Amino acid sequence: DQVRRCLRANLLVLLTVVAVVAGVALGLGVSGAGGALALGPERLSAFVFPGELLLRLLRMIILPLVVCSLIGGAASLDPGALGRLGAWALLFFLVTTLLASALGVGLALALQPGAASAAINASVGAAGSAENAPSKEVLDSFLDLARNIFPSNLVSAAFRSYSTTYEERNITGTRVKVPVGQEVEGMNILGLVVFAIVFGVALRKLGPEGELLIRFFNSFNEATMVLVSWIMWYAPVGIMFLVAGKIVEMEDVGLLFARLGKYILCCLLGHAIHGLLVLPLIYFLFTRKNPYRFLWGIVTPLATAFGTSSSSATLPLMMKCVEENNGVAKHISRFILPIGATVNMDGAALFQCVAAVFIAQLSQQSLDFVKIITILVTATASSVGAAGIPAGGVLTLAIILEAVNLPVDHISLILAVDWLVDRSCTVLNVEGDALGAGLLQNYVDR
Amino acid sequence: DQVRRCLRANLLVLLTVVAVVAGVALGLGVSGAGGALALGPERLSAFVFPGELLLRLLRMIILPLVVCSLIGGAASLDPGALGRLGAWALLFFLVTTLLASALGVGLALALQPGAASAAINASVGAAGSAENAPSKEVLDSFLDLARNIFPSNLVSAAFRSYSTTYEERNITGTRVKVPVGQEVEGMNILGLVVFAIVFGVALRKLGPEGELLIRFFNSFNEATMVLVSWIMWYAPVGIMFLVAGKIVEMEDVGLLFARLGKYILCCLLGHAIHGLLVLPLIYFLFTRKNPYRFLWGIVTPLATAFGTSSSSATLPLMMKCVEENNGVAKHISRFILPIGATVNMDGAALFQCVAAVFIAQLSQQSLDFVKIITILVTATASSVGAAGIPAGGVLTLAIILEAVNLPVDHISLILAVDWLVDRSCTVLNVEGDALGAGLLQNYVDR
Amino acid sequence: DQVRRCLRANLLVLLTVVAVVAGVALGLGVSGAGGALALGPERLSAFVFPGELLLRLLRMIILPLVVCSLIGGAASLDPGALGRLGAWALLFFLVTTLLASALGVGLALALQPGAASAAINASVGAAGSAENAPSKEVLDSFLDLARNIFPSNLVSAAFRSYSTTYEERNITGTRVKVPVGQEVEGMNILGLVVFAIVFGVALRKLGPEGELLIRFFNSFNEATMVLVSWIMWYAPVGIMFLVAGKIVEMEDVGLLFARLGKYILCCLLGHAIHGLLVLPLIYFLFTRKNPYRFLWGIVTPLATAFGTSSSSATLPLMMKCVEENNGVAKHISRFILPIGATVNMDGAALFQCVAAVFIAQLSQQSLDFVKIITILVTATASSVGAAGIPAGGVLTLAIILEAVNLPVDHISLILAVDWLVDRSCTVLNVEGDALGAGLLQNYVDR
Ligand SMILES: *[C@@H]1O[C@H](CO)[C@@H](O)[C@H](O)[C@H]1NC(C)=O
Ligand SMILES: *[C@@H]1O[C@H](CO)[C@@H](O)[C@H](O)[C@H]1NC(C)=O
Ligand SMILES: NC(=O)CC[C@H](N)C(=O)O
Ligand SMILES: NC(=O)CC[C@H](N)C(=O)O
Ligand SMILES: NC(=O)CC[C@H](N)C(=O)O
């Protein structure tokens, strides 16, 4: 049969999408028959482990990749030409993030998710529970991101980021708060991207003395790219257990879709127009080429981002598929795509935009025109400061609301539905990188 | 004199064994005349320091060795031949560990250490003291070892391993336990062995691009091997203070040997037959060569393992003595011996076997035939999960006993005698590596 | 104009000294008009940030420099000649530190800072506040420094040093203290200097196998030296905010200079004679060359040490200025100057000498002749154990006083004036390195 020929050449494509629907059929049979209580907590961790093992070993290789592949990328061309590459790049990440957040106002206002329904029953969901939050100030977190760039110690920025807390050591009368930083747990991806680019330029200023050093990091880049190919074969096995592990936790067979299902359909549709109708239209307007043939070549990482629910996870998996399947250049694909891992959270700019209108569609708040331009520019700024940590964008939602002085009286409605909507967020998040990667292929042709 | 000629060529052999008996004569004069109280705690740390300095600097070089020497080892030969090297290897570590644990049942049953003596006075030793223990479940620790393999972050696995604890954040009615992991202190040796082997194969799949990279790690391996030679000369000084520091702590001039000295003679004899009568018989059955001439060439690391009481400590010291003194190959000795550091704790499979019969010889427990095959297969499994941390195998003793549902009413009798029996454990532990290393020299001759 | 020609060639010299006086004029206008309370604590951290950003990114490059530049330095020459370089070196650091501490007795006794003034009103300053201190014993901290050399783990010594605390887990009757170490936060500079020197010698014992490895670390050294040049241009901006941030904290417009201003003039004059009259006289006695033409070539790092107030901070900044401006050799300047970062705290030997006479000039204490030779040799020993941490030498002041059994009834007078006197300490501290660096240039001419 001739149909057997195309299936052998599309083996990873077929196995990935058949597994993401397998766990939904697997997990609903677990959640329906018996439920979460039938397994027991001492066995539930053993069930979710073959999915949780996937997210582990696929994360350990981004450290010898991102600090390594940006060297050989940003030391080939000249630093005068890198400004002709970088300035057109950061302009593109700013427009795509801002245009996605502009859809958030334009879709939530025309649908009004704060409608007369069970969603307005937030008093049963609030309970004063999530009020006990750190909720750092908007001046401090914006100051914290500039301090997270240019890290303190180079080894310490491989596993331990920087943040800030508050204390009250102020027995003087009128007890005030005092900021203090303590370097909490978490990998600093952004702190090492800005190091490797600056370190990559310094090898270009050197003459033939750096020729030994650049071929070292070129070879050490290539050995990791061999090792990411073997994890790619394991990836259809793990995604079957990512979805079928998370679905055991909550239930939406008539409970979660009943209360705030209008909001869920509001934000999934925000991911529907953007990145499936807008980004192909932008890509065709600059290339005049078929975007879906480009999009079909990248479907294993995009389905993996739905499973792993982390943009920083699926970073090496996309770097294999873009340079192999689609016709891009070797060196420039390994530069614009890793810097795009933590700079264009436009899904978060679409998630935190709608969710900040959603609580203001209810509870009778105006937002006529002055708050609209502030809620538009804040979400496209905090998206840069967001990490690739799963469910990390919920923490940056509270700093938008205080700056636009909306009530935070129940943030717990937007919370506890982010096991589903954030998986759609990462797919839209990582898609604009490779669409921007192929957009620079036409730019070098002229 | 002709006797002066052999002593100059056997200088390290003579100085090492004269120092391990020097500290016993030194420490008993300290423990006898004056005792531990005559020195004071502010001076006792200053006394144990020249031994404690030895265990420190000899441990800092295993990180630029194990992740480095396994690269140049497992990138020379073909990956098809590595399966012909690896499968025969892991079969040998399984048999030697299981045969050692089979001696534990066969020697404790024929001697019955739970005899009518002062050893049955465990009520004075129990006191409900060591009941306050974490004692993680057998399903979780077996799950934890698979998660400790394939580490989370590559830099973070150089000093910080992974484990798990328990919390009770369960105010819902019927308060249950919940697992949580927090990455406690401790070097992950096993997490980096599995990384370097996979990374070593990927250089072999590369062509001449990896030729620069393999010669880098070949040279960086050799510079450490120079530096381990200088610490080897310091090693007879330190072992004199390892033994004469630990002996100041407890006393066995008629007190510890009186109560449970039958148990101590039971487990030291278990280390006597295995690895001095069995392993020479296995080595002669496959080589038909003199095992003791091979064994005399490795006596400085084996006496160092008695002093340091850590298998992961004496790993670089054996790698010098095997490739220099005995006639083994250069590349294959630096592969099978580091992977054997944390895979064949057969002394622990002999220690945790007898100690789990010892508490069941007392307190009237049966173990007729069904528990015997479970207590045999559990100890040979948890020996793989054991670390090279001194006195680390005591924590893995409790997970055997709950799985074989024996009482843990006094584990503190097996505790606080492990300053002596565990030093015999590490000597038997590290011996089977080099005997297995020389066993593969005959395998390449055919 | 011909005066425009010299200003273009002295751009860094002119911009650095015009900024250290700019912040004094800036900060006094802030402290005078409005004061510290006019800004608010939520804005004060935003004001001090462009200075605090300078101290951050200029510290992240000392890890890929000190462990890297000492390799290519101490592997070129022979190890027989390194003893002819090292022994003359460590003799020079011992004399310069001891001669500086000899000035501390000779200047405090001839001035008597414990005079009838407001400085003797220490009862208002003591309050029993700083009595709650750890204050580890003199035998333990001297033992701790030898354990901090030869670190435990190589990766862990890049951000996490070693220290010791005390516990009282001693329910046996007569509750005593027990030492325990826990690896507190802080970069171990000294632990990696002793590693790279020993590792550098081992490459020299290797033949042409180390030729690949030495050219690797030679190139990786040079790429950092490019990157330190770009931070040097940012350095006149940051020092303007270092001084104008610290001056907002305290006030000395008639308050701090009134109470103990005799002591401040006593210790600043101790930094005046030493290192501006003594060290030029020593340098002229061995070179017969102009020391101030050598001293004018290094004025950007010396003014930076006044701003950063850390010897370990300004280590790469001096390594650029010495090898470029002044006529020293390339390889030997990158060896003696990094080892001099944490070995010759003679300012601390001048600070901790005077401050230990200052509390004994008051409160009627003798120190006739026997305590004088002990207070001289203790301060030159603890200066080696001092770190490059700002305000780190105050902790090592208490261990001098107990060994010379002077009262520690108010150490808080020497505390809280170290925002000013310690900035003079680091300038004198880092100056003797480069004066010692140029002193070895004449030694290689013969
Ligand atoms: C220990 O056990 C023996 C019996 O074997 C008994 O006679 C004795 O009283 C017990 N206690 C002590 C302190 O010896
Ligand atoms: C300071 O000391 C002087 C004596 O020299 C005394 O007259 C004055 O009252 C003291 N001031 C305070 C505040 O104690
Ligand atoms: N909510 C967010 O967008 C941040 C977390 C999300 N998983 C991401 O990596 O994009
Ligand atoms: N008790 C044990 O056997 C644990 C391992 C042992 N400390 C070793 O290094 O060999
Ligand atoms: N007072 C001191 O000596 C502390 C250390 C000093 N700040 C230095 O960097 O050398």
| Torsion angle defined by CA atoms of residues C394, C400, C406 and C408, in that order, rounded to the nearest 10 degrees | 30
User: If you search the block for the tokens 């997970």, which residue do you land on?
Assistant: B399
Count of CA atoms in the C-beta half-sphere (13 A) of B264: 19
Residue B427 near residue B305 (C-beta atoms within 8 A):
yes
For the CA of C117, the nearest atom of ligand 2: 5
In whole angstroms, what is the distance from residue C234 CA to residue C58 CA?
A: 10
Q: Chain B residues with CB inside 8 Å of A158's CB? A: 153-156
What secondary structure letter does DSSP report for A395?
Answer: G
Distance in Å, alpha carbon of C229 to nearest chain A alpha carbon: 10
Residue A202 near residue C227 (C-beta atoms within 8 A):
yes
**Residue whose CA lies nearest to ligand 2 atom number 2:** C118
Distance in Å, alpha carbon of B220 to nearest chain C alpha carbon: 7
Count, residues in chain A: 446
Residue A104 near residue A98 (C-beta atoms within 8 A):
no
Q: How many Cβ atoms are within 10 Å of A317's Cβ, its own excluded? A: 24
In whole angstroms, what is the distance from residue C273 CA to residue C275 CA?
A: 6
Nearest in space to A150 (alpha carbons), one of C220, C59, C241: C59
Q: How many Cβ atoms are within 10 Å of C167's Cβ, its own excluded? A: 9
Distances (CA, A) of C166 to B55, B141, B380, C129, C169: 23, 33, 40, 20, 10
In whole angstroms, what is the distance from residue C24 CA to residue C32 CA?
A: 11
Residue B153 near residue A158 (C-beta atoms within 8 A):
yes
Helix, strand or coil, per DSSP, at residue A55: helix
In whole angstroms, what is the distance from residue C252 CA to residue B108 CA?
A: 79
Residue A160 φ then ψ, to 5°: -135, 110
In whole angstroms, what is the distance from residue C295 CA to residue C195 CA?
A: 31
Asked if the Cβ–Cβ distance from A227 to B199 is below 8 Å, we say: yes
In whole angstroms, what is the distance from residue C359 CA to residue C407 CA?
A: 8
Q: Chain C residues with CB inside 8 Å of B388's CB? A: none
Pull the structure tokens for residue C340.
Answer: 């001099």
Residue B131 near residue B401 (C-beta atoms within 8 A):
no
In whole angstroms, what is the distance from residue B103 CA to residue B354 CA?
A: 9
How many A from CA of B100 to the centre of ligand 4? Answer: 15
In whole angstroms, what is the distance from residue B386 CA to residue B141 CA?
A: 11
Distance in Å, alpha carbon of C54 to nearest chain B alpha carbon: 26
Pairing of strands A165-167, A178-180: antiparallel
Q: How many Cβ atoms are within 10 Å of B302's Cβ, its own excluded? A: 21
Helix, strand or coil, per DSSP, at residue B248: coil
Ligand nearest to the CA of B309: 4
Q: Which helix (H) or strand (E) holds A179?
A: strand A178-180
In whole angstroms, what is the distance from residue A238 CA to residue A51 CA?
A: 4
A154 in C contact zone (CB under 8 Å): yes
Pull the structure tokens for residue C220.
Answer: 């990786």
In whole angstroms, what is the distance from residue A230 CA to residue A243 CA?
A: 22
Residue A367 φ then ψ, to 5°: 45, 65
Helix, strand or coil, per DSSP, at residue B185: strand
Nearest in space to A434 (alpha carbons), one of A366, A333, A344: A333
Residues 206-265 of B with CB under 8 A from A: 206, 209-210, 212-213, 216
Pull the structure tokens for residue A435.
Answer: 């669409």
B188 is in an annotated binding site: no
**Residue whose CA lies nearest to ligand 3 atom number 3:** A348
**Residue whose CA lies nearest to ligand 1 atom number 14:** B118
What secondary structure letter does DSSP report for C119?
Answer: G
Neighbour-count burial for C58-86, b at 16+ CB within 10 Å, e otherwise = bbbbbbbbbbbbbbbbbbbeeeeebeebb
Q: What sign results for the dihedral spanned by CA atoms C67, C69, C75, C80?
A: negative
Contacting residues for C29 by C-beta, under 8 A, at least 6 apart: none
Which residues pair with residue C185 across a beta bridge?
C160
Residue B335 near residue B444 (C-beta atoms within 8 A):
no
For the Cβ of C217 lying below 6 angstroms from any atom of ligand 5, the answer is no
Helix, strand or coil, per DSSP, at residue C186: strand
Task: Determine whether A48 is exposed, middle or buried from the number of CB atoms within 10 Å of its CB (0-12, 13-18, 19+).
Answer: middle
In whole angstroms, what is the distance from residue A436 CA to residue A432 CA?
A: 6
Nearest in space to C360 (alpha carbons), one of C406, C310, C411, C326: C406
Contacting residues for A247 by C-beta, under 8 A, at least 6 apart: A23, A24, A27, A28, A30, A31
Task: Determine whether C358 is exposed, middle or buried from the number of CB atoms within 10 Å of its CB (0-12, 13-18, 19+).
Answer: buried
Contacting residues for C6 by C-beta, under 8 A, at least 6 apart: none
Task: Determine whether B415 is exposed, middle or buried from the number of CB atoms within 10 Å of its CB (0-12, 13-18, 19+).
Answer: middle
Q: Chain A residues with CB inside 8 Å of C59's CB? A: 152-153
In whole angstroms, what is the distance from residue B351 CA to residue B347 CA?
A: 6
Task: Determine whether C381 is exposed, middle or buried from the number of CB atoms within 10 Å of its CB (0-12, 13-18, 19+).
Answer: middle
Helix, strand or coil, per DSSP, at residue B186: strand
Q: How many Cβ atoms are within 10 Å of B1's Cβ, its own excluded? A: 6
Helix, strand or coil, per DSSP, at residue B75: coil
Pull the structure tokens for residue B91.
Answer: 């079969």
Given in angstroms, what resolution was this structure solved at? Answer: 3.8
In whole angstroms, what is the distance from residue B188 CA to residue C153 CA?
A: 12
Contacting residues for B402 by C-beta, under 8 A, at least 6 apart: B135, B137, B138, B408
Residue B411 near residue B398 (C-beta atoms within 8 A):
yes
Residue A375 near residue A367 (C-beta atoms within 8 A):
yes
Q: What is the CATH number of the domain that holds C110?
A: 1.10.3860.10
Largest Cα span, chain A: 85
Asked if the Cβ–Cβ distance from C41 to A176 is below 8 Å, we say: yes
Count, residues in chain C: 446
Helix, strand or coil, per DSSP, at residue C166: strand
What secondary structure letter does DSSP report for B254?
Answer: T
Pull the structure tokens for residue B353.
Answer: 């076997």
How many A from CA of C362 to the centre of ligand 2? Answer: 14
User: If you search the block for the tokens 């005068």, which residue do you land on?
Assistant: A80
Residue type, C237: V
Helix, strand or coil, per DSSP, at residue A186: strand
In whole angstroms, what is the distance from residue A87 CA to residue A246 CA?
A: 40
How many A from CA of A195 to the centre of ligand 1? Answer: 70
What secondary structure letter does DSSP report for C160?
Answer: B
Nearest in space to C245 (alpha carbons), one of C427, C34, C27: C27
Q: Which helix (H) or strand (E) holds A266?
A: helix A256-273
Asked if the Cβ–Cβ distance from A159 to B146 is below 8 Å, we say: no
In whole angstroms, what is the distance from residue B128 CA to residue C47 CA?
A: 58
Residue C236 near residue C12 (C-beta atoms within 8 A):
yes
Nearest in space to B426 (alpha carbons), one of B402, B391, B384, B395: B391
Residue type, B358: F
Residue C51 near residue C245 (C-beta atoms within 8 A):
yes
Nearest in space to B70 (alpha carbons), one of B210, B226, B212, B214: B214
Residue C68 near residue C221 (C-beta atoms within 8 A):
yes
Which residues pair with residue C411 across a beta bridge?
none
In whole angstroms, what is the distance from residue C279 CA to residue C99 CA?
A: 10
Count, residues in chain B: 446
What secondary structure letter does DSSP report for B340?
Answer: T
Rg (CA), chain C: 23
Nearest in space to A23 (alpha carbons), one of A434, A426, A423: A423
Contacting residues for A392 by C-beta, under 8 A, at least 6 apart: A386
Residue C318 near residue C301 (C-beta atoms within 8 A):
yes
Pull the structure tokens for residue A12.
Answer: 């990873």
For the Cβ of B123 lying below 6 angstroms from any atom of ligand 1, the answer is no
Beta strands in A50-170 (DSSP E): 165-167
- Domain of B292? 2-445
Mind giving me the DSSP string for B147-175? HHSS-S-TTGGGTB----EEE---TTSS-
User: If you search the block for the tokens 């109470």, which residue do you land on?
Assistant: C259
Residue type, A170: N
Q: H-type helices in C113-169, by residue range?
A: 123-126, 138-148
In whole angstroms, what is the distance from residue B161 CA to residue B194 CA?
A: 14
Nearest in space to B384 (alpha carbons), one of B171, B56, B101: B101
Pull the structure tokens for residue C309.
Answer: 């107030």
Residue A34 near residue A217 (C-beta atoms within 8 A):
no
A98 in B contact zone (CB under 8 Å): no
In whole angstroms, what is the distance from residue A16 CA to residue A12 CA?
A: 6
Count of CA atoms in the C-beta half-sphere (13 A) of C360: 22
Q: Chain B residues with CB inside 8 Å of A185's CB? A: 183
Helix, strand or coil, per DSSP, at residue B91: helix
Distances (CA, A) of A228 to A327, A339, B75, B154, B199: 20, 19, 18, 15, 11
Distance in Å, alpha carbon of B198 to nearest chain C alpha carbon: 22
C254 sits in the region (left: phi over 0; alpha: psi -120 to 50; else beta) called left
Nearest in space to B218 (alpha carbons), one of B430, B435, B65: B65
Q: How many Cβ atoms are within 10 Å of C320's Cβ, its own excluded? A: 17
Helix, strand or coil, per DSSP, at residue A180: strand
Mind giving me the DSSP string for A308-345? H--TTTSHHHHHHHHHHTS---HHHHHHHHHHTTTT--
In whole angstroms, what is the distance from residue B190 CA to residue B170 CA?
A: 34
In whole angstroms, what is the distance from residue C232 CA to residue C54 CA?
A: 10
In whole angstroms, what is the distance from residue C294 CA to residue C292 CA?
A: 5
Mind giving me the DSSP string for A152-178? S-TTGGGTB----EEE---TTSS---E
How many A from CA of A396 to the centre of ligand 3? Answer: 10
Residue type, A142: F
C363 sits in the region (left: phi over 0; alpha: psi -120 to 50; else beta) called left
Which residues pair with residue B160 across a beta bridge?
B185, B186
**Residue whose CA lies nearest to ligand 1 atom number 8:** B118
Distances (CA, A) of A321 to A12, A311, A434, B304, C103: 11, 15, 10, 51, 70
Residue type, B15: L
How many A from CA of B361 to the centre of ligand 1? Answer: 18
- The count of structural domains within chain A is 1
In whole angstroms, what is the distance from residue C301 CA to residue C314 CA?
A: 6
Count of CA atoms in the C-beta half-sphere (13 A) of C246: 23
Nearest in space to A356 (alpha carbons), one of A385, A380, A340: A380
For the CA of B117, the nearest atom of ligand 1: 5
Mind giving me the DSSP string for C289-340? S-HHHHHHTS-HHHHHHHHH--TTTSHHHHHHHHHHTS---HHHHHHHHHHT
Method of determination used here: cryo-EM
> Terminus-to-terminus CA distance in chain C, angstroms?
44
A254 sits in the region (left: phi over 0; alpha: psi -120 to 50; else beta) called left
What secondary structure letter does DSSP report for B275?
Answer: T
Mind giving me the DSSP string for C50-115? HHHHHHHHTTTTSHHHHHHHHHHHTTTS-HHHHHHHHHHHHHHHHHHHHHHHHHHHHHHTTT-SS-
C421-443 vs C300-308: helix axis angle to the nearest 10? 150
Count of CA atoms in the C-beta half-sphere (13 A) of B176: 8
